[PDB]
Design a protein around this motif. Structure first.
Motif, PDB file in Angstrom:
ATOM      1  N   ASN A  19      21.984  77.392  49.105  1.00  0.00           N
ATOM      2  CA  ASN A  19      21.545  76.838  50.374  1.00  0.00           C
ATOM      3  C   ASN A  19      20.082  76.429  50.271  1.00  0.00           C
ATOM      4  O   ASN A  19      19.311  77.014  49.509  1.00  0.00           O
ATOM      5  N   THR A  22      18.158  71.218  53.171  1.00  0.00           N
ATOM      6  CA  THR A  22      18.731  69.878  53.173  1.00  0.00           C
ATOM      7  C   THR A  22      20.248  69.874  53.074  1.00  0.00           C
ATOM      8  O   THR A  22      20.912  69.213  53.882  1.00  0.00           O
ATOM      9  N   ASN A  23      20.827  70.592  52.109  1.00  0.00           N
ATOM     10  CA  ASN A  23      22.237  70.436  51.778  1.00  0.00           C
ATOM     11  C   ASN A  23      22.851  71.803  51.486  1.00  0.00           C
ATOM     12  O   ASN A  23      22.218  72.844  51.673  1.00  0.00           O
ATOM     13  N   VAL A  25      25.416  73.285  48.277  1.00  0.00           N
ATOM     14  CA  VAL A  25      26.086  72.954  47.024  1.00  0.00           C
ATOM     15  C   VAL A  25      27.031  74.100  46.687  1.00  0.00           C
ATOM     16  O   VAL A  25      26.636  75.079  46.046  1.00  0.00           O
TER      17      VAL A  25
END
Lengths: 42, 49
Positions: A19, A22-23, A25
């Motif tokens: 974490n 922004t995103n 994965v």
């Protein structure tokens, strides 16, 4: 971030959530982690 | 190219996979990466004709 699996680095595919601001994965592959799992910033 | 696994330590849960290929041991003596006595590779071939 969180790490799931049976072993690390190889010999078994491992779940991997990273974490940030922004995103997200999520990625089930082998990857490389040492005995001290941490995310470098700079 | 088509292979199956005939030896495993425990039964498999639903919708899971086992891609790793290690030397299976069913005894007190460790295999140590050598397919010698009491050492069997789990990935066996069909061999279609």
């Amino acid at each position: 971030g969180w790490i799931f699996g049976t072993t690390l680095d190889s010999k078994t595919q491992s779940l991997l959530i990273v974490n940030n601001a922004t995103n997200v994965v999520i990625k089930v592959c082998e990857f490389q982690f040492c005995n001290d799992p941490f995310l470098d910033v700079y | 190219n088509y292979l199956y696994r005939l030896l495993r330590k425990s039964k498999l849960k639903p919708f899971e996979r086992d891609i790793s290929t290690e030397i299976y041991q069913a005894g007190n003596k460790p295999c140590n990466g050598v397919a010698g006595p009491n050492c069997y590779s789990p990935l066996q071939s069909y061999g279609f004709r």
